[PDB]
């Protein structure tokens, strides 16, 4: 190339165009989402509610742990009775988009996701730098945060360029 | 790009890392952890699987065939064209992820010949190029195609390097069409 690219840049492009925008456009068309309540052993939906989405669209909360090395664990630990798995059958893809939602009684409070793609940032660092370098002067932590903040910044830049009103919140925990 | 924080990667490098560790390797570990595949036969008007067959995965595992169109700009359209009757949608409920992994299968009667995917993540490569470079540059000396070809070859090369640093199952073949 001519241009410097950080690893999380292309990950952010993909996350926006192959996930977030697909969910937004599925909202603006179908105005509805599928909530999974009961699932058989093969992890197959059996009891599924239709839930009509509204112009006051629920905010898509992207949550990323600073401990990016723990992300693949944090995606099985936030799976709790308080949350419910939802999915959206968009025309963009041959399989639906799966998300997590917070439900108070009959009301979707929020839709959250932990971006599994951002793990590839951590792995790409672990494979470009020597372990010696990473374990020196807290270098690994500085690289992980640069990659997270680059990810968030690229999403911001992508929403401005597409003249899209924000539809997401980005929180690091 | 070392001994300092001025490190560049090609866009397709981190995409390939994600595609391998967050998709290919997860399928392999579902196979190795004796998780069977679900074949979708019947679907409702919504598109919800009505009939599923369980299918047993045996240690001569089926080869994961990654197919990439040279016309990367059409990839999001190709992922809707190769959803035909001659191929069946399958899925694998792996313990790695809270939603299953969805693939396309080739079946001779009941035998699984091969599992194939078109890597949607590689579309991000094309979009990164369309965003970094001026329209003037991309149309000048066939620059757009040169960059896309380099991105596709880098993607396959990165996959090859990642299996080598781990275990050479060679569970995948990579063909450009
Ligand atoms: N919660 C949620 N997040 C979603 C969903 N679809 C996409 N994402 C997010 O968006 C990233 C980009 O997905 P992609 O561009 O299709 O690029 C994907 C795609 O090419 C492939 N892939 C991953 N899972 C599947 C799958 O179940 N089936 C197929 N056919 N390909 C998959 O691997 C790439 C990387 O996957 P990830 O590292 O997980 O990174 C994914 C993930 O972080 C979804 O339905 N739910």
Residue numbers in the entry:
A (entry chain A): 159 to 331
B (entry chain B): 155 to 331
The paper states:
A recent groundbreaking study discovered the ancient origins of the cGAS-STING pathway in bacteria, which play a similar role in the immune system to combat bacteriophage infections. Binding of cGG to bacterial STING causes it to oligomerize into long filaments and activates the nicotinamide adenine dinucleotide (NAD)+ cleavage activity of its fused N-terminal Toll/interleukin-1 receptor (TIR) domain. Depletion of the electron carrier NAD+ eventually leads to bacterial growth arrest or cell death, restricting the replication of invading phages in infected bacteria, a strategy called “abortive infection. In this study, we demonstrated two distinct mechanisms underlying the regulation of bacterial STINGs and a structural basis for cAA recognition and oligomerization.
Through analysis of hundreds of bacterial STINGs, we found that some bacterial STINGs thriving in extreme environment have insertion sequence at the beginning of C-terminal STING domain. We determined the crystal structure of one of the longer bacterial STINGs, Larkinella arboricola STING (LrSTING) to 2.73 Å resolution; the asymmetric unit contains six similar polypeptide chains of LrSTING (root mean square deviation of 0.3 − 0.5 Å for 127 − 149 Cα pairs), which assemble onto three V-shaped dimers with a cGG bound in the central ligand-binding pocket. LrSTING dimers are similar to previously determined cGG-bound bacterial STINGs (r.m.s.d. of 1.3 − 1.9 Å for 185 − 195 Cα pairs), with the exception that LrSTING contains strikingly longer β strands a and b (βa and βb). The longer βa and βb form a continuous β sheet with β1 and β2 and make extensive interactions with βa and βb of the other protomer, forming an additional long lid above the original lid. Superimposition of the three LrSTING dimers in the asymmetric unit revealed that their overall structures are nearly identical, except for significant conformational changes of the additional long lid, suggesting higher structural flexibility as indicated by B-factor values. In contrast, the long lid of LrSTING (chains CD) form one interchain H-bond (K202/T206) and one salt-bridge (R199/D208) at only one end, whereas the long lid of LrSTING (chains EF) does not interact with each other. It is thus suggested that the three different lid conformations of LrSTING are probably snapshots of a dynamic process of lid opening and closing, suggests a regulatory role to control CDN access to the ligand-binding pocket. In summary, these data suggested that the formation of an additional long lid of LrSTING results in autoinhibition, leading to attenuated E. coli toxicity and anti-phage ability. Here we report that dozens of bacterial STINGs contain additional insertion of 14–15 amino acids compared with canonical STINGs and that the insertion sequence correspond to an additional long lid above ligand-binding pocket in LrSTING structure.
